[PDB]
């Protein structure tokens, strides 16, 4: 299918968004409503995710987290706002989105000419530090710069699932926005937290991995140019 929504553990689901270059995002089905982690590529892909959500739950979509300011994590924002969901990020992500959205849309369209020229749609709930949702069961945090300066992790403690958006994946990927020397330092700050982790969801490539995806990507980025 163009997009799938599949249970990984309990209320934690993975979105495989096969539009453009495949990106994987998360959905958490909570008591009061639904939290989406990663807005998906465009308002149209966001609508496709919402259609899948409505086959699982009638509860409202409460909020969507932009794990960084890029098009694959924030492009769906216009749709989420339109249905009354909050769009949530760190202040750093929001500020970078304000200044750099035009640049990232242009960069996206260089690789994907078919991708739309999306207007800026900023987060309307901004956090200055780490933050939680769903009565503490969805936990967002910053551990330093990596793939972009601002990317955050989202941890689901009950299910021992870690999502890093674009930070964790199988292939090296684009480093044009990256801090190549800080990247492994951020991954080591992450590992030093000693979070119980059964599953890491990669943000690109095949999503389902164990904790070893962190070490896999760390070894790749240490061999990269500018390391
Ligand atoms: O940098 P990432 O991991 O988001 C990935 S490698 C990426 C790079 C360029 C373009 Cl146009 C699309 C994508 Cl999905
Ligand atoms: Zn990405």
UniProtKB/Swiss-Prot annotation:
PANTHER family reported for this sequence: ACYL-COENZYME A THIOESTERASE MBLAC2, METALLO-BETA-LACTAMASE DOMAIN-CONTAINING
Cofactor descriptive note: Binds 1 Zn(2+) ions per subunit.
Ligand binding (substrate): 108, 147, 169, 174
CDD domains xrefs: CphA_ImiS-like_MBL-B2
Catalytic activity: a beta-lactam + H2O = a substituted beta-amino acid
Annotated phenotype, changing residue 66 to H: Behaves as B1 and B3 enzymes, which are more inhibited by 2-picolinic acid than by 2,4-PDCA
EC numbers: 3.5.2.6
Molecular function (Gene Ontology), one example: beta-lactamase activity
The family this protein is said to belong to: Belongs to the metallo-beta-lactamase superfamily. Class-B beta-lactamase family.
Function description: Confers resistance to the different beta-lactams antibiotics (penicillin, cephalosporin and carbapenem) via the hydrolysis of the beta-lactam ring. It is able to hydrolyze penicillin and imipenem, but is much less active against cephalothin, cefotaxime, meropenem and ceftazidime.
Induction pattern: By either cefoxitin or imipenem.
Positions of Zn(2+) binding: 72, 166, 204
Keyword Hydrolase: yes
Keywords (A to Z) from UniProt: Antibiotic resistance, Hydrolase, Metal-binding, Periplasm, Signal, Zinc
Keyword Metal-binding: yes
Major location category of this protein: periplasm
Originating organism: Aeromonas hydrophila
Superkingdom as given in the UniProt entry: Bacteria
This protein's name: Metallo-beta-lactamase type 2
Subcellular location: Periplasm
InterPro entries: Beta-lactamase_class-B_CS (IPR001018), Metallo-B-lactamas (IPR001279), NDM-1-like (IPR050855), RibonucZ/Hydroxyglut_hydro (IPR036866)
An annotated GO cellular component: periplasmic space
Cofactor(s) recorded in Swiss-Prot or TrEMBL: Zn(2+)
